[model samples]
Target chain A: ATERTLSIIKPDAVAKNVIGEIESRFEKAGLKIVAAKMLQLSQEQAEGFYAEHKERPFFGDLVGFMTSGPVVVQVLEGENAIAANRDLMGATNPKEAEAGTIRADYAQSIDANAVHGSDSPESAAREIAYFFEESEICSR
Target chain B: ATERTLSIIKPDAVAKNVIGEIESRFEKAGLKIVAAKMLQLSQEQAEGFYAEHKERPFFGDLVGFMTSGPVVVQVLEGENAIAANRDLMGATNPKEAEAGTIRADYAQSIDANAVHGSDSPESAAREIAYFFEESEICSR
Candidate 1:
């Protein structure tokens, strides 16, 4: 079945100027890019966005790292996009990520793993709506 | 600082034919559409995508639901994009999402939430790279 999922290019990677390189993988995989943007996140905004992780000890660090710089956001649609995107992401820890995967190829470490993919369709729904509105998605 | 993030229109919304209605929201919010596509996924692909949840009991159902239909994907770019997208998305659970947010306005429930967005910069990078290679994304 076809699926849609959320993907992001973090501050570190963007600072390194690999947006084009990152996007190329998706296109090659046959995943379609429907919407995109670049922006920075404030501490409060980052905190709120990650409110679900409020109970985690590293929540503050996560928010701090996110607010540290600019990032790229996008929407991907395709066959099992949520899973496809995640597979492309590889393991969360670059050291553990499979070779050729984005993390293994570009991520600095676990804390700095290069990208993010929704864990489930439920999260995918929430995550997509988080960045885009009903109207912003566009019809293909 | 300017940044980019990811977003997705879930299967239900696409089946409901609200793709255009969704895209408009991002455009209205000032996010730019950089890329997009539509497709379907196989079970094995879905399994690989959700590998992180391999140990979860709900994994099977999650994959089943995601593979149930087609979906729309996109990339958005703009200022404070990470947080901007999240604000636009509202809470994950539609019941708790604030009024006027995408989920609050269009989502039927947590499972049927209409969209998804990147939660952090680190995640953003990995997610973007997961689906896209550097050459595929166009420079605006």
Candidate 2:
């Protein structure tokens, strides 16, 4: 069975206007774009979304940064998609990432990394459900 | 003018079996897929991809993780694509993403958050060029 994962285009990337370029990379790599939407986050919404990080020292900064602008929310599906997406995203801190990876190319800092991907299947399930209703996601 | 963006399906999501589920979301959202491919990034490729992060603390981990598996790369197109795509991706840290956002729904942790998107037009341009040749992308 094909797998699924969640992904994001951070505000920093959006502000700079390269959505097409990023999408092209995914298409070239063979991961399908299954579900997507555009929305700006509220402080409250950001807080709830990142509830797991509440205890982390960077929680405040993270919420502030995420809510700073609009974002693209998507569900990607394929074989080993979680790992695949992670590979493309490189490290959380762009500074230490591989050259061709998303973060390494565009990320200005760990917090400003250009993209995000699910870590596991369990999380993918939770994430797909979080953004998309059964009807919201299409059946191909 | 219509714009384009790059997207990726990381290994983790590919492994979990939700590729179709994720693609459906994007189709429903109105982003068009122009091109795509799947490949296992070699260490040199991964290092080259994340070359910008060569001096960072997490560079080693980032490269190791990316080379650990395969990934799907793609191109997405539509009106105001840069911002539109960003909105669809939501926050980088799932915890801070909106409830209906991809990260909020699919991501398990900050490091494992699913998906990737271009952060800016400049980065997007550089990123797309990094992964694809001009002929690989479709005109439609």
Candidate 3:
């Protein structure tokens, strides 16, 4: 029943200083952050990571926001990890997020949402692989 | 007024599953986790990491214990960070640790202490360098 999913503490949240707090929520909920790092995404890096949105109206702005500052990328492991991480992250639009969720506690706007969670196992695998090398991802 | 320190969630705690809980304590106390990673230290790496202890009786076994499993290495930043981290970690011997402190709550013995924090700024610097390179340490 164990699984691994990718999660991100976005630039907005990193600038607001919530990496530890955001991680705490996942931790309290039984997620183990087995792999993690802090980095400032390059223009090319962000664009490639969100390449699927290339033709979308929001693509350029989304890349700009991601490259704005340093962000923490992490892999959380637990049962139903991909789904649980999304639940803990709350709605992408903070306004609709649950009162006690991460977005409700720290997000500023839809685009400035404080964190990111993979929506499915496939996306989780891709995102996690995109960020961490196998040696960097630890299992206990 | 700001400083950085290195913290480690040791093997025993990793096996006992408290990485998130430990991180939560630090985060709730306002420490920013600027950099982090998880890896299993090799014998040579562990020996060098605890090199100062090499002259002590516990050196060999210490290396053995550290290599027992994977550890979460993170860099925490804040005002008076080095001392604050030491305080949050509590006494090295859990029996002498204060109530509500990490060691008191999770550590099994002195050798199996749940986490590790730098004792002074010098050690913090050395420890951080020992575990991470300049490219790896992200400050924001």
Candidate 4:
């Protein structure tokens, strides 16, 4: 079955100018890009999306980095997409990630892991809704 | 050598909601999406981009059709990208396109063909410039 997942080319990768290569990994793996937008997040927008992390010590840094520049938020679809997107994105820490994964290739530190993907189906639904309006997104 | 070309998911396709499957075709063909944006064109913007057709009788209709909805403009990069993009797009007339091509699959007529690709290297530069500023584009 096909699944939809949210993907964020985070400000680190966006600023490093690695959006194409990151998108290529998912595309080559058969993850289809259904919808996308580029925007500079406001403080409130960033805070709201990362709200689940509001209590974490690093939350402020995370929100700060996300709002520093323009980021590409996309909806990707494919079989097992939630897992597949996470696989391509690799481990949260670049140094501990696999040899050929997205983070290993582009990420520098744990704080700026280059990309963000939803961890579960429910998370996918909520994250997508936060950034995308009904008409702004489409199906396969 | 790898080349970069421009691609547009035209308004007809946008309205039909076929963006993902179309992007899937290019991705499966190894076309790397270097940069992308989605926007609804204004009359002036559409007219300016289609200025080459200014002398043609169908120019007005072309502009009108293009401004009808939001379209996706992308920069695709790969070896022989210009030729590859055009080949995948097939002929201008869907009736004359190959059996499995994009136009044959999605287009309804010559005037409303589902997609557009830069015709030449120079055209790619011009078209990309028209829709994307330097900061909006990236290299592999």
DockQ of each: 0.02, 0.02, 0.54, 0.14
Specify the highest-DockQ model's number.
3
Global CA lDDT of candidate 2, please? 0.71
Off by over 4 Å in 3: none
The ten-residue window of minimal lDDT in model 2 chain B covers B13-22
Candidate 1 local Cα displacement, residue B87, angstroms: 39
What's every prediction's RMSD, in angstroms?
18.0, 19.5, 2.0, 6.8
Summing lDDT over every window of 10 consecutive residues in candidate 3 chain A, give the lowest-scoring window: A15-24
DockQ of 4: 0.14
Local distance difference test, per candidate? 0.74, 0.71, 0.87, 0.84
**Which scores higher on TM-score, 1 or 4?**
4
Which 10 consecutive residues of model 4 chain A have the lowest summed lDDT? Answer: A14-23
Candidate 3 lDDT over B18-128, as tens digits, reads 676787788778888888877888999999999889899988878888889888888999989899988889999999999889999988888898999999989999999
* Candidate 4 residue lDDT tens string, B1-140: 69989899898886665665687678778776677877667899998999999889999889988887778888888899999999999999999999889999999887789999999999998998888887776554
What does candidate 2's lDDT look like per residue over B1-140, in tens digits? 68788877566555444444455556657776555555566788878877999999989877776655556677777777667777777887778888876666666765565667788788778777888877666534
Which residue pairs collide in model 3, if any?
none
State the lDDT at A72 in candidate 4. 84
